[PDB]
Amino acid sequence: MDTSFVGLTGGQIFNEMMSRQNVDTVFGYPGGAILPVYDAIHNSDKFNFVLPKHEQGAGHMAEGYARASGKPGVVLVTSGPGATNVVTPMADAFADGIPMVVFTGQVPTSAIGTDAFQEADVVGISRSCTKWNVMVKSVEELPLRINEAFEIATSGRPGPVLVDLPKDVTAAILRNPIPFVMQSINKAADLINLAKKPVLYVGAGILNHADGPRLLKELSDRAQIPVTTTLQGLGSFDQEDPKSLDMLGMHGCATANLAVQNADLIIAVGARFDDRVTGNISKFAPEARRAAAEGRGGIIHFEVSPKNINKVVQTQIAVEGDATTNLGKMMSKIFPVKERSEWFAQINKWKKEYPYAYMEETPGSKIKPQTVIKKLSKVANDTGRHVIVTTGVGQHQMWAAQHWTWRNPHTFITSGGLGTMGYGLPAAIGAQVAKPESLVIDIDGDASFNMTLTELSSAVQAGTPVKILILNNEEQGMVTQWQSLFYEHRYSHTHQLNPDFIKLAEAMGLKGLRVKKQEELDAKLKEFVSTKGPVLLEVEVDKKVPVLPMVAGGSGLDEFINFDPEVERQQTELRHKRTGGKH
Template sequence: MEQYYTDERNVQILIALLKAHGIKQVIASPGSANVTFVGSLQQDPWFEMYSCVDERSAAYMACGMTAESGEPVVLSCTGATASRNYFPALTEAFYRKLPILAVTSTQEESKIGHLIPQVIDRHQQPSDIVKCSEHLQTVKDEDDEWNVTLKANRAILELDHHGRGPVHINLTTRYSHNFSIRELPSVKVIHRYLPHGKLPPIHKRKTAVYIGSHSKWKPEDAALLEAFCHAYNAVAFCDATANYHGKYCVNYNLPACQSIADTNKNPDLLIHIGDMSDEAGMVGTPKEVWRVCQDGKLSDRYGKLSAVFEMSEGDFWSHYVAMAKEENGDDSYLMSCLNMEKRILGKLPELPFSHIYVASRLHDKIPENSVMHLGILSPLRSWSYFRFHPTVDIYCNQGGFGIDGNLSSLIGASLIHPEKLYFGVVGDLSFFYDINSLGNRHIGNNLRVLLINNSLGAEFLLFKQTNIITCVNDIESYISAENHFGNQSSVLVRHYAEDLGFEYLSASSKEEFDKVYPRFVTPELAEKSMIFEVFTHVKDENDALKRMWNIEIDKSLKGTAKKVVKFLFGHEGMNTIKSILKK
């Protein structure tokens, strides 16, 4: 019977990536758990196979081979205690910095601890035998395939990352007897580049930079980014907390959520910089992603990562600007994006009294050279639709992305520069979660807190959550935590704020808001810090978001019908209607 590759997808992916990364020397020890791996390798003449019965000797053989050849060597063993015999030689390899990839095969992790023969726990490794350890699970769906591919790339790249050394992969098998796969799958190979190495070229294609949450920009780095964008006809899609306000900044949050087809989305190459961002999906689905970060980690937000540049952003821009110095600059992509942004902002709908309405009125009135802290979800989204003055620094606790600590972070920042105004925007749940921080005796007169109080977690009741949460009855009682904290009491926050020495402002309508907000955004330091409580209702919040997402809609009958069905019934409702029409 002819034998080819196993049908176990995780094994196929690992083998394909070994070949893609140029690793061919393998020392195999006998066993049953590694049959699908070794049986696939031995029929592929590309690999140089060696046999060794004793795993301890096999690992020491690998030390000798890699020290002599300079090339990585793969070890393969079965389950049970076989892998424990690798420890002495892997310790040697760790301290001698020898690139050995120990692949230990195993049954499903779910069998650990259930008295099943030859199943041992390999979750933790001694700190000085391998640089990293990854588990490649059975592939059951696309998410598993992405995860296995990413982890296999990460393990292989770690063999020579910050110096060489041994790495461990725990490879699950289901003991498949099917070796009928004639060709390995096409796999995504991820490369890591260092500052002084040879970097890949950027061929002429639609290129964009996405800037997630970012610290303050050095002027020279911002200038290099702009030189890069001009040289490659690129744009910089910016999160609200990107803190880049230069010529190539594109505030794409509002255009991206429109239903009309948008040819500016889905860049061919997306260069991803910055940290965590809730709005990263606004650029659509890029064909390829390069991640630029000094930690060199394989952070694959879009599932399309092909390269990681372990270097400063300044080094990255400098290199590619130098490579493009013979090319003519072109800003046509920028002009296209800015024209779309301008067109949509020019058609803003009449909004009900809501968080988005408040943001639409205040975004350009926040005083120059002040600092804004946005709470997660609604504050971050609502204010991201608009541009601030370029001298306003914007931050958000997007790292852990929780509602706790927004006020405390704002207060801590305000203590650094008491002469500067610090604004914060939070919802009622976040406000009351962290309310004790307002009693801190170090608070000065430079704090301005905007509290959007709708007496629940409105996020869970918005139309965009239809497929995730709103299929559950009585969401208000527990999931969105309705009617806590005084149920929009008109005096609760007032008394607390004033007793602590804050100036208190409030509004429950557009008319009241228009009378009060000028005081809140006055550019001079007032005698006291301020708390501005705005009372809204979830129905208006939902309606405002719908209107913002439908400034430009698909004008075709088919598109309109789809949009209506989607809004009324969600994705599941659309699928149900489709199934009915087919009958």
Template structure:
């Protein structure tokens, strides 16, 4: 029922009505009325971060690991501008977020008042939609609309900017409307004629590939289940983007691994040589396509996506299907079964023979050491020792992120949180805080590089304050690893500002926060050290000292096609090029 209340109370009531249980935020003058209301209730928990960027990344981790929208609360001016990186990150990766920002009173807007910023103007390019609330009577409607927009169609971040006088004023609160009452209603059902034509193409394809992305995970558990059923029924191989890992199990026998710039040789070769490529919930990102004019040059292409603006934006496709992944896959399976479950099995068997030949390259092979921990080895041991546990992985951005994608394996969706499109250093630690808050009994590990990790190191305070036992697994090579690798391979080994010459003692840093610090530099000690990290019942900083100049392969050099990859010299025979790599 409609009832009278202050704008600040409306905010809390709307969050309650939307099923929100956690808000990540940082208080300030322009949001104190909302914080006062948060203090007077017990339904919603507020997690005090140490930086507003971390609040948004924590909300991203919460959202990605639960499938529910994440919520962040920040003050005006610098509070809102500090949230911009997280908003852009969520927009690029289609993460549903609601960011509530305070604003100076309406009568002061435009006066350059204390901590005033044009938040709506600043965040317009990095949100799915945003609103400036100018009347308390409009606040409930806009808050409910924010949740609807963030979670409908292609998910994304939204922002509601709430002036302080709107928070103090009294108005009429209206409860959450039915979803059908909103004007924004993206179509979820795909065109049946296009779906039927795609099934016909699948029936005669000799070299099909499923290319999947984060849209499968965003569509919910049903989409992942339907994808698995479709892959197993047809027998076609499947690959995935960085954001789509876990939608199809890595242990599945149709799995080719990740594709793209640091994807597996067999996945990239299959994408290049296929004759039918079915893109499901991905957007043909440049890290996937390489040279667009040479991308999968001989294939008929299909694209299933909820966002019509993504289709034919980068790669022209023959079967454009706008719709929610789960709905489209359900229809696709039904039509395929109704038409007799037909596939060219003989051609498919030959296609798999070629793929098995590509797998013999063993593209992830590396030269191990008995004296120095190789980063690949560290992640192999982390995978082996945590396999089967209730485990969630977040990452920072760089070489360690790609190695984690290559060497850690995910059989379920929502277990892998990483910054894909924006590539945000500093994402992983606060994201792990959000994941741990959502899953208090789970093992949450942030795979980090020392450079990325230092960008939001202050969140150790958050982890300690709320008893969140997040494990920070830092592959410490004392370098900006990916920058250094590119400088070695592409810039004549001129290492411009890519060596970290002043790093903290991470063990002492952990202890300064009251957490546990572990350092390991000997491969022989690594298993015991990892188990010590896992078994400790609080936050841990694990300083894993690794080979300083190891390169991440495979790698598609900039401007090259999928079938022009650099492999490490342990993967193939041939003339060794720069950085111990061979062009194949």
């Protein structure tokens, strides 16, 4: 038995447990039910505390922190509204597999089920958006539940867990002492050595191991296999390398999508074949299916969660467990490929004919959002500092993914599964806390920013010099794009009235910069990244600009729509006509 906790309150035990769990930062907001814990951590030197203005902010900050550090994000909020306010961050973390331990205060056990003040069935509400949750029933089991929580949140596919803490439990004083894969790997190696047009389809899974990108590069080099990544995989592969296919999917480049449709063997590494990547499932990877029917190729899936194997598409070989680990074991079984003339020739043909094209700036026209990303990408890189990027949700998010040059793992923190608008700012703040020395940039949209802009003041109080970039098109761009394309340009409530972003930033205690003219863009971006403290830069960009290429509806990854200058001009005329000149 152990007695190192005897005599301590549940809250004090919590304080100690954070230390034992190597927790160096806690994001939270106090409240009545959780007071016993806040009293115990008052002026605690075991970890730093970050106070947001809204619990949702604490949640997304914790996700940002976890994404940039690899450590679980710890949240501490009160009962009722405190707990319900973190449901979105949990659902978000659940969708993207982010390690997060949410601690929610709860009314006394003697008040549960009586419709008590600020009481909510948090365990029930968060059941579908947590890998596991529980309500601590006594101080004796607090250490155990805390240990199980951290373990579960960081095992298998990382995810969020919730621990409900009744007020009487955290106030209570502890009085008494307390207590085959190899086979798949072999077949996988043979299939690869037998592939004539292989493709590595890499996702976030490869980033869950410090050696992930290293081994990925090793395999790519050894077998000379081109690599394409999902949105969440960006950064795991050097895009400067000739073997990089860039991003695939709904808004991925043509090369990446075509290679996937013509590949005889798809090597899926830490990717779940979500509906934003596969396109029309029945049309997905036609050549791989043909190679599978001929026993000369198909799909190999390195997946840690059995539930995600054969969930979307039938695979030929499944390698269960950590991807990085299994890739290391298979390495030696892989035959060094000299070169793939034909494969690389076809791929390079596509790259030269299908680049991320778009309507560039013309004399007197407004600034193009794509151009802003390309310029900022270079300006940021030229600082020589470690750069981390977060984003909101929408077009600006896709443009950031496409036009930025990814080379470093854990440098792109964006909401993909749930796609939570407002993620940008709080995520950046969290990331900055995790990497104090890094340059953290939040590439945001005006609508997304409006969702959680109150956290600007939190950036100041937390001492996080985040760089907030707002690509202002005065519209919910991603939605208007769908409205333009699928709903005859009927913009139904997709234009919110924006506040003055510069005056807002200043009101919040940040420096505010704005750019309207092309001739001032370069200087503004430079001043932006070189500013010492937190700063916000608003760039007025062109409106109703579609993100291309694009695969939607029943279209296959190869049935994408590409950019065409003449088509854009025709759409503009049609749009003006249908909106009476309003848009």
